[PDB]
């Protein structure tokens, strides 16, 4: 409703870097808000793409941002009669970023890895890796839970079980309020997908440079499966957290698996031991139900509700025809121990190929009426195909079915405006929470400031 679309703030990164592919708000130890921006194709030292991360101080005028530096060099370690190797070329550093406390986590889902032993090898594969930084102190650490040192022949002899070679850990990421980093790894266990969790504190204290393979004992990984419903499900394509079991001492995980069950798609809610509490099934095959998930209480009863994006949903139209437009599903959490039911509300896009529901961002309470609100992105939406973000306001019965406000991309065709979104943080300290929108195709980020309701 009350985001100001007249005076925006623009930040920009290098041409071709995909600056804006991911972003988050970051608060320094003093509560000063900055914006961390991933740019997963930023050029490294060897004039080769490795990705990079930027930490943008808040300024009404925006502009350029300093780098948040991470080690971009390939590593080798001969130890235990083996040769360990990391390969950072085209790793996509900054393909996801998230901030917690005064720490920043930036992931390179396509970092490759191999172990050589005489004439044998693990196979060079994208295990992915996450980099951690505490900007104020300069501390650095890494977390790469799918790295292993088993040789190729052993997987074959063991029928490819517990095969974490193609994890792409960090493909998605989130951090619990208590500081547990949770990574989605859609390629885990031969393309089923897995989650990996570990406290940020233990990641820092157990890491040392050059080791490459090390133990984080408090870590916890999800499980392989023989059930074909899970095969190629990309469980962990998206992830989120929230409170869904009524017990405030446990944190529940929300996991998107957009190709679950022969591309039907699914979203699952789990306890922190990866035991399944609920499963929402996609409505239409290939719709990519679970591409995005958001958790926020929209109807003011203190119970977290779930939103799920299916950006390729095809809506039924006149004459037995189907139009790909995308759809968002709202599920309101019921009082006490009970199942989430059918969706409480379906939101459906209008522009052909617009990908409505490609991202969904909680806004906190934008207009300050006591109900939390959301923004939904349609990165190729709008009458001109340039991209739109639509704001929907919470209300006692869930969400309004019609957008209170629509933000049209200020960038040229192809920017993917809205592909990444983040809200619910007051960056200019005016008492209203604001919205940051990534347009990686244009290597820019736009900041929309919320203003008093007119």
């Amino acid at each position, epitope marked *: 409703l009350n985001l100001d679309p007249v005076q925006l703030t623009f930040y920009a990164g290098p041409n071709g870097s995909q600056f804006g592919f991911s972003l988050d708000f970051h608060k320094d130890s003093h509560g000063r808000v900055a914006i961390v921006v991933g740019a997963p194709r930023t050029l490294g030292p060897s004039q080769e793409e490795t990705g990079g991360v930027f930490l943008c101080p808040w300024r009404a005028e925006g502009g350029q941002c300093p780098s948040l530096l991470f080690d971009l060099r390939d590593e080798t*370690r*001969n*130890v*235990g*009669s083996q040769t360990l190797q990391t390969f950072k070329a085209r790793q996509g550093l900054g393909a996801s970023v998230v901030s917690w406390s005064d720490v920043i986590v930036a992931c390179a889902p396509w970092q490759h890895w191999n172990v050589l032993e005489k004439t044998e090898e693990a196979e060079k594969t994208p295990v992915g890796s996450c980099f951690l930084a505490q900007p104020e102190s300069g501390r650095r650490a890494e977390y790469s839970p799918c790295r292993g*040192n088993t040789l190729s022949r*052993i997987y074959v002899e*063991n029928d490819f079980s517990w095969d974490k070679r193609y994890c792409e850990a960090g493909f998605s990421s989130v951090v619990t309020q208590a500081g547990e980093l949770v990574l989605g790894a859609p390629g885990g266990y031969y393309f089923l997908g897995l989650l990996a969790q570990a406290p940020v504190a233990d990641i820092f204290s*157990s*890491y*040392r440079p*050059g*080791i490459l*393979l*090390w*133990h984080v*004992s408090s870590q916890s990984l999800s499980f392989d499966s023989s059930n074909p419903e899970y095969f190629d499900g990309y469980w962990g394509y998206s992830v989120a957290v929230g409170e869904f079991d009524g017990d405030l001492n446990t944190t529940e995980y929300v996991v998107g698996a957009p190709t679950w069950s022969w591309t039907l798609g699914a979203v699952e809610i789990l306890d922190s031991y990866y035991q399944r509490l609920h499963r929402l099934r996609g409505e239409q095959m290939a719709s990519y139900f679970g591409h995005s998930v958001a958790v926020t209480d929209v109807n003011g009863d203190g119970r977290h509700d779930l939103l799920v994006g299916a950006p390729l949903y095809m809506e039924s139209r006149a004459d037995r025809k189907l139009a790909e437009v995308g759809r968002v599903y709202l599920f309101l959490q019921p009082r006490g121990p009970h199942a989430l039911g059918a969706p409480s509300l379906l939101l459906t896009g209008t522009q052909l190929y617009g990908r409505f529901g490609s991202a969904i961002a909680p806004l906190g309470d934008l207009d300050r009426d006591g109900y939390n609100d959301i923004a939904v992105a349609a990165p190729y939406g709008g009458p001109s195909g340039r991209g739109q973000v639509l704001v929907f306001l919470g209300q006692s019965e869930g969400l309004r079915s019609r957008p209170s406000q629509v933000l049209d991309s200020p960038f040229p065709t192809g920017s993917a405006f809205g592909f990444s979104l983040r809200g619910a943080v007051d960056i200019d300290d005016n008492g209203y929470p604001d919205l940051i929108v990534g347009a990686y195709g244009a290597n820019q980020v736009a900041v929309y400031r919320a203003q008093p309701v007119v």
Partner: antibody, heavy 119, light 108 residues
Framework: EVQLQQSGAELVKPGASVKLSCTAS????????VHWVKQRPEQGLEWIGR????????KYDPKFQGKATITADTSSNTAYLQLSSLTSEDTAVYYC????????????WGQGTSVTVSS | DILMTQSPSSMSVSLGDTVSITCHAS??????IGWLQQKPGKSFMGLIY???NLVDGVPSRFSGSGSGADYSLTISSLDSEDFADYYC?????????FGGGTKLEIKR
């Protein structure tokens, strides 16, 4: 807290066999490699081998090929070192060991099991 | 196998001294070395891993250094508890092999 609690001193005769145990305490034995090391006053410290209790895969120093058999039961959070065709020279103290962080290191040690082979 | 020649086999020193134990490998081992401590009639405690890294709980008066095939453990300002046996171990290659050991003894 990580502790490796090994079985008690053994007292056996030459030609016999004995099986020692190393029980994880405060952690899952399946988390890391578990090694066995032999110590004698004269010969010093010798690496026997290791096992990955998650899957049972072992490595040995060729010197101990034949006498030493390393096993593990994740159920009883325990790892074993079986010695066969015992001899005077098998008389020594035996330790189980696991790394702290580095996959390949040797940082945590059990209290050690004394073995004496005599007639 | 890689041979680990640890020196000296023993040394007589006193509370407060700064002493160094060295270890030489029969080939480069790129910092894949550990240092261990055995107190009289007790088990072992880890001190250092990967050349220079303190094991959790070990006081900083202990420090490890070196590269290629030559490494050193150094103890600044010896404490009463520091009189014991010390061993280096290489894990660059299987089989892991150990140094001959070093015993710190009270001078008088």
């Amino acid at each position: 807290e990580v502790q490796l609690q090994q079985s008690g001193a053994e007292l056996v005769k030459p030609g016999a066999s004995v099986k020692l145990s190393c029980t994880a305490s405060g952690f899952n034995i399946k988390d890391t490699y578990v090694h066995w090391v032999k110590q004698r006053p004269e010969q010093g410290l010798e690496w026997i081998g290791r096992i990955d209790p998650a899957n049972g895969y072992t490595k040995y120093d060729p010197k101990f090929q034949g006498k030493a058999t390393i096993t593990a039961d994740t159920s009883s959070n325990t790892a074993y070192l079986q010695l066969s065709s015992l001899t005077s020279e098998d008389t020594a103290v035996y330790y189980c060991v696991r790394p702290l962080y580095d996959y390949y290191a040797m940082d945590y040690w059990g209290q050690g099991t004394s073995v004496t082979v005599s007639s | 196998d890689i041979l680990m020649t640890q020196s000296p086999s023993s040394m007589s020193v006193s509370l407060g001294d700064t002493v160094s134990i060295t270890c030489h490998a029969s080939q480069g081992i790129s910092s894949n070395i550990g240092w261990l401590q055995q107190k009289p009639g007790k088990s072992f405690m880890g001190l250092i891993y990967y050349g220079t890294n303190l094991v959790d709980g070990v006081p900083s008066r202990f420090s490890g250094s070196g590269s290629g095939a030559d490494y050193s453990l150094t103890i600044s300002s010896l404490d009463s508890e520091d009189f014991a046996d010390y061993y280096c171990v290489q894990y660059a290659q299987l089989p892991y092999t150990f140094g001959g050991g070093t015993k710190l003894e009270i001078k008088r």
